[PDB]
């Protein structure tokens, strides 16, 4: 009979902390018998599993309907903090009922900010702010008015200061317009370089100088240089921490200065500077051209609170938490959950996502401790090419622990003013720069009760802007999905070890190391190597991606970063005591917690590698937001890249929750006049209203609808889509769009006119809007009319009588054919011209970001699958095979990220992990695996494998919302066999290539017609076989 397998709610089994008013239920079904359909369903919801026999929440009754996917709960209003148990049964076409599904559950969260009583808290100023320059002065040589203008020259400065006894700490914060070199008692402690200066004065350095300072007289010496005629000055504070208190030494007129290069020895204590004039104050801090310059601190501080709970039986405990920043929570000596980088990146002004954890087994009678690390993340740390403090200056925590007891009583413990804070071991934590950890600074026992925190500091109430909304997390939290042990160790320079993980991955490592306390190991991360085996990092640009660990000297130490991530295949290890082995470093692969949903294997090793690389490029860039690259100083939610890649993404991973979440980010960023931004979340003032980029607001909801049959994503998008079309029509002339935007980004010397691109995308968005309106049962006429008018304008402007398209590029034909812009009479001619251009490039593509995803599909649509296969199997540059032969394990940003001569493309922009060119995937899955949606969400599957090129054998399984869709085919000794599995409540259209269609043997289904050299069959669910001999 028919049975329900793996029922889900909002795409997952047993969601915890789900705030949806009408959660959507799904019931994949299984049957060993073919041809099964659902005629009806009945859902029950109750407050207990046992209670489902007499349900107290909802009973839908028997509902006549074949709906089995994303069916919205339609009972009484759901309440916060409540677990709802549910079961479904179905009736088949003959009216026989299934068993009730094994009871499952979902649990609501807080359902809005009003249910929180917690307060936002931060570590206090001594722990969050770097030593400040306030109270100090910018100084220079006494010449003119240096804050206005000084010569392009070097000046020299000296100060001898009598330091206090019992110094326990010493820090120097220093900045110069334009550069400096500073020494203590003749030893250089810091410098900046002219040839690297880009307004370096804005970014003071903070240096630990305890190793060079002592009590009594210390001689400080500074050289500073001005880069050109204009303002000059340098500023510092030396902060000495003592047993007594704090002592500060400033840059000021007590310093001596000279404008003539001094004799050598000028940095030494006993040098004679009695003839030097006093330095001149150029401006007090905050004055001059420089403003309120401050060094940046990025500690991940420890926050904790101990509390007593009653000695009663616990029924349930939940922790609800979030941060402006990142956090990791601990309760009674045990880490809470397995999420990384919680709560993820949203526009924190508009929303922050919160997490719900089951901590029933962790709570104790009597004494308890709740604790957290709180780090800068995207909220306060470096973001893209834009520096830190994008949303706020320092991170904040919100936490609410609810304990329910068997007697019906409860306790609530919250973040608030009674919590205490300490620096702990995470000295610095930045997504881009890396994490710095000193194991000697650990505070053993801090996450457990009975801990001595008298010398910890009171927390402050956070001064952060309050998010408008606190929302249950929509996407799968980032979690470690796999470990990659190092596969070999090399030593390309003495004491510099490089460990190869064998795959370009995203996450961070586990380091295992034994040695003396105070030994510091440095870990740098790279996507590629230099020809000499050293790591190449120039393409990372300003992202250091460096983690630093200082040992505590206790056995085989383990270091795992928490508040950073990197994109890398190779790890360079320096400062290691002895020689690392393969066990010393292990990659921890991190991404959204969503299943992989497409298994694909052919007889062709190169295609199998291509598929692997696609899935690695996807997972590497699916951490909180869909990123362009996970490695360099960017990692932004680029609309264009996800536009092109979304249809492929939705084959290979369950991408519904992930891209649903992202589309909320995109709509949060849409401008008041309706323009979608180039990136979302919107940071760095990058721009908006770009064809092929902003259009992701239309194309991504449509891609999700096609793959999943998710109608809610269309309903949620259509208003923003309307506003986008209004914006586009306003910014056009006779419906032709300007030649602006990124265009067919990174094409191979075949640049498509940007007005052709822009007008084409405008038409396509109108087309998709009409399709959305139609699916939702709304009036589609206005959108259809708009599409008609744009297509007419497009054809008149850009399409010639012989079918040539303006620009005559591969992408010009690909886009116009794909988007149905070529007049029907001229499709043949346009496609012939495309093939001619490919032939003229010696059977190579020339397409960039926008052309590539549509290239092979258009070729197949126009009767040139053989050409598609020629391009697919191509191994020389440019092609998919070319990087694979060079050892790629992901998709590269450029067709020539490594050039034919072996050199790298320009580090100004050159990533080895962009998913855009992995858009070939959808062609393979639809045409080699033969798995494509005939109706949205695979309610009907079109099974049309097209054997060709080198492919004689293929097998695939797609995990659709209805259950598995599988194919297996083989050409052997003239014959062809295809087997497939089609899940209950769906149907298939199967195309079997044959010289004689009516001769095709088949266990199930009905021959309906011969078309395009195939027997076409319509078949219901089941395990089918087709044979041609
Ligand atoms: C304040 C001023 O800012 C920039 O124009 C340069 O960094 C210059 O050298 C500096 O003097
Ligand atoms: C304070 C002290 O005085 C003298 O011994 C010299 O001037 C010496 O260099 C200085 O550091
Ligand atoms: C390459 C492939 O990718 C995903 O399906 C899983 O991580 C699987 O374990 C791995 O082998
Ligand atoms: C136009 C934009 O340019 C690069 O800087 C991004 O990494 C992204 O791939 C692309 O869409
Ligand atoms: C998040 C942040 O918000 C504002 O300060 C600006 O829009 C800026 O460009 C962006 O980076
Ligand atoms: Ca200057
Ligand atoms: Na959850
Ligand atoms: Na449905
Ligand atoms: Na002297």
Curated annotation (Swiss-Prot):
The active site is at residues 634, 893. It holds the Pfam family Bac_rhamnosid6H. Optimum temperature is 50 degrees Celsius. It catalyses: Hydrolysis of terminal non-reducing alpha-L-rhamnose residues in alpha-L-rhamnosides. GO terms for molecular function: alpha-L-rhamnosidase activity; metal ion binding. Alpha-L-rhamnose 1 binds at residues 628, 632-634, 641, 693, 914. Residues 131-295 are annotated as: Carbohydrate-binding module-67 (CBM67). Its EC number is 3.2.1.40. Ca(2+) binds at residues 177-178, 226, 231. Transmembrane segments: none annotated. Keywords: Calcium, Hydrolase, Metal-binding. Alpha-L-rhamnose 2 binds at residues 177-178, 201. It is an enzyme of class 3 (hydrolase). The keyword Metal-binding applies. InterPro entries: 6-hairpin_glycosidase_sf (IPR008928), 6hp_glycosidase-like_sf (IPR012341), Alpha_rhamnosid (IPR016007), Bac_rhamnosid6H (IPR035396), Bac_rhamnosid_C (IPR035398), Bac_rhamnosid_N (IPR013737), FN3_sf (IPR036116), Galactose-bd-like_sf (IPR008979). Optimum pH is 6. One of its GO terms (biological process) is carbohydrate metabolic process. It comes from the Bacteria. The carbohydrate-binding module-67 (CBM67) binds L-rhamnose, it does not bind L-galactose or L-fucose, demonstrating that stereochemistry of the sugar at C4 and/or C2 are important specificity determinants. Also, removal of calcium through chelation or mutation abrogates L-rhamnose binding, confirming the importance of calcium in the binding of its ligand. Belongs to the glycosyl hydrolase 78 family. Alpha-L-rhamnosidase which is able to degrade p-nitrophenyl-alpha-L-rhamnopyranoside (PNP-Rha) in vitro. Releases L-rhamnose from citrus flavonoids such as naringin, rutin and hesperidin, and the arabinogalactan-protein (AGP) gum arabic. AGPs are a family of proteoglycans that are localized on the cell surfaces of higher plants. Cleaves both the alpha-1,6 and the alpha-1,2-linked rhamnosyl residues. This is Alpha-L-rhamnosidase. It comes from Streptomyces avermitilis (strain ATCC 31267 / DSM 46492 / JCM 5070 / NBRC 14893 / NCIMB 12804 / NRRL 8165 / MA-4680). The lineage of its organism: Bacteria, Bacillati, Actinomycetota, Actinomycetes, Kitasatosporales.
């Amino acid at each position: 009979a028919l049975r329900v397998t793996s029922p889900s709610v909002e795409y997952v089994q047993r969601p915890l902390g789900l705030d949806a008013a009408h959660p959507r239920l799904s019931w994949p079904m299984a049957s060993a018998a073919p041809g099964r359909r659902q005629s009806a369903y009945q859902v029950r919801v109750a407050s207990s599993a046992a209670g489902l026999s007499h349900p107290d929440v909802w009973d839908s009754g028997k509902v006549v309907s074949d709906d089995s996917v994303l069916v919205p709960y339609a009972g009484p209003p759901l309440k916060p903090r409540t677990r709802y148990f549910w079961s479904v049964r179905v009736w088949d076409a003959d009216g026989g009922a299934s068993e009730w599904s094994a009871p499952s559950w979902w649990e609501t969260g807080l359902m809005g900010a009003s249910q929180w009583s917690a307060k936002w808290i931060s570590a206090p100023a001594p722990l969050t702010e770097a030593p400040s320059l306030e109270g100090s002065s910018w100084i220079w040589f006494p010449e003119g008015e240096p804050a206005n203008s000084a010569p392009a020259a070097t000046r020299w400065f000296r100060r001898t200061v009598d330091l206090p006894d019992d110094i326990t700490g010493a820090t120097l914060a220093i900045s110069a317009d334009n550069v400096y070199a500073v020494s203590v008692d003749g030893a250089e402690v810091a410098r900046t370089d002219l040839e690297a200066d880009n307004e370096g004065w804005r970014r003071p350095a903070v240096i630990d100088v305890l190793d060079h300072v002592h009590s009594g007289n210390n001689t400080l010496a500074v050289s500073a240089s001005n880069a050109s005629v204009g303002p000059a000055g340098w500023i510092c504070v030396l902060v000495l921490t003592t047993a007594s208190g704090e002592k500060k030494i400033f840059s000021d007129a007590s310093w001596k200065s000279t404008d003539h290069e001094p004799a050598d020895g000028w940095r030494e204590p006993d040098f004679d500077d009695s003839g030097w004039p006093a330095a001149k104050v150029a401006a007090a801090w905050g004055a001059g051209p420089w403003g309120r310059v401050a060094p940046v601190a990025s500690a991940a501080n420890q926050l904790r609170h101990e509390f007593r709970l009653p000695h009663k039986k616990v029924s349930r405990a939940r922790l609800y938490a979030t941060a402006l920043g990142l956090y990791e929570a601990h309760l009674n000596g045990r880490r809470v959950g397995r999420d990384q980088l919680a709560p993820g990146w949203t526009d924190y002004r508009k929303r922050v996502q919160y997490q719900t954890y089951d901590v029933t087994s962790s709570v104790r009678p009597g004494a308890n401790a709740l604790a957290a690390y709180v780090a800068p993340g995207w909220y306060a740390g470096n973001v893209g090419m834009f520096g830190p403090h994008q949303y706020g200056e320092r991170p904040a925590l919100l936490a609410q622990l609810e304990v329910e007891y068997a007697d019906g009583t409860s306790e609530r413990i919250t973040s608030g003013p009674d919590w205490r804070a300490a620096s702990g071991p995470i000295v610095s934590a930045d997504l881009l720069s890396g994490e710095t950890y000193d194991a000697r600074k650990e505070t053993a026992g801090w996450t457990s009760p009975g801990f001595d925190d008298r010398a910890w500091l009171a927390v402050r109430g956070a001064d952060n802007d309050v998010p408008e909304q606190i929302v249950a997390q929509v996407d799968g939290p980032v979690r470690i999905a796999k470990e990659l042990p190092a596969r070999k160790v090399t030593e390309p320079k003495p004491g510099v070890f490089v460990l190869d993980l064998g795959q370009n991955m995203v996450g961070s490592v586990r380091l295992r190391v034994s040695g003396d306390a105070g030994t510091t190991v440095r870990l740098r991360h790279a996507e590629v190597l230099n020809p000499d085996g050293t790591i190449y990092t120039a393409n990372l640009r300003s992202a250091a991606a460096t983690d630093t660990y200082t040992l505590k000297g206790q056995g085989e130490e383990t270091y795992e970063p928490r508040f950073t991530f990197h994109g890398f295949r190779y790890v360079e290890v320096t400062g290691f005591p002895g020689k690392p082995s393969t066990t010393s470093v292990t990659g921890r692969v991190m991404h959204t917690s969503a299943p992989f949903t497409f298994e694909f294997e052919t007889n062709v090793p190169m295609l199998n590698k291509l598929h692997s690389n696609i899935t690695w490029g996807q997972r590497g860039n699916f951490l909180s937001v869909p990123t362009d690259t996970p490695a360099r100083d960017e990692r932004l939610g680029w609309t264009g890249d996800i536009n092109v890649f979304a249809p492929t993404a939705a084959y290979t991973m369950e991408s519904a929750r992930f891209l649903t979440k992202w589309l909320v980010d995109l709509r949060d960023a849409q401008t008041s006049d309706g323009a979608f931004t180039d990136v979302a979340p919107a940071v760095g003032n990058l721009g908006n209203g770009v064809a092929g980029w902003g259009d992701a607001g239309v194309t991504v909801p449509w891609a999700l609808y096609q793959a999943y049959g998710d109608r809610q994503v269309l309903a949620d998008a259509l208003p923003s889509v309307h506003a986008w079309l209004r914006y586009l029509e306003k910014h056009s002339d006779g419906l032709l769009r300007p030649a602006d935007g990124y265009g067919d980004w990174l094409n191979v010397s075949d640049e498509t006119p940007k007005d052709v691109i822009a007008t084409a995308y405008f038409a396509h968005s109108a087309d998709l809007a009409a399709r959305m309106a139609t699916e939702l049962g709304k009036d589609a006429a206005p959108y259809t009319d708009l599409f008609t008018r744009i297509r007419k304008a497009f054809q008149t402007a850009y399409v010639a009588s012989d079918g040539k398209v303006k620009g005559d590029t591969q992408s010009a034909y690909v886009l116009t054919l794909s988007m149905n812009l070529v007049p029907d009479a001229l499709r043949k001619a346009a496609a012939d011209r495309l093939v001619a251009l490919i032939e003229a490039k010696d059977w190579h593509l020339s397409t960039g970001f926008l052309g590539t995803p549509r290239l092979l599909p258009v070729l197949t649509d126009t009767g040139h699958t053989d050409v598609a296969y020629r391009l697919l199997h191509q191994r020389t540059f440019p092609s998919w095979g070319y990087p694979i032969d060079k050892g790629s394990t992901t998709m590269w940003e450029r067709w020539d990220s490594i050039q034919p001569d072996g050199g790298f493309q320009t580090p100004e922009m050159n990533s080895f992990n962009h998913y855009a060119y992995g858009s070939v995937g959808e062609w393979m899955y639809a045409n080699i695996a033969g798995i494509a949606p005939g109706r949205a969400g695979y309610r009907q599957v079109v099974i049309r494998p097209r054997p060709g090129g080198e492919v004689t054998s293929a097998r695939a399984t797609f995990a659709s919302l209805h259950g598995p869709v599988s194919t297996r085919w083989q050409q052997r000794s003239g014959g062809f066999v295809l087997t497939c599995s089609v899940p209950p409540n769906t149907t298939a259209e199967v195309w079997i290539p044959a010289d004689h269609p009516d001769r095709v043997q088949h266990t199930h289904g009905t021959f309906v017609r011969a078309e395009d050299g195939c027997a076409v069959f319509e078949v219901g669910s089941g395990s089918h076989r087709f044979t041609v001999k």
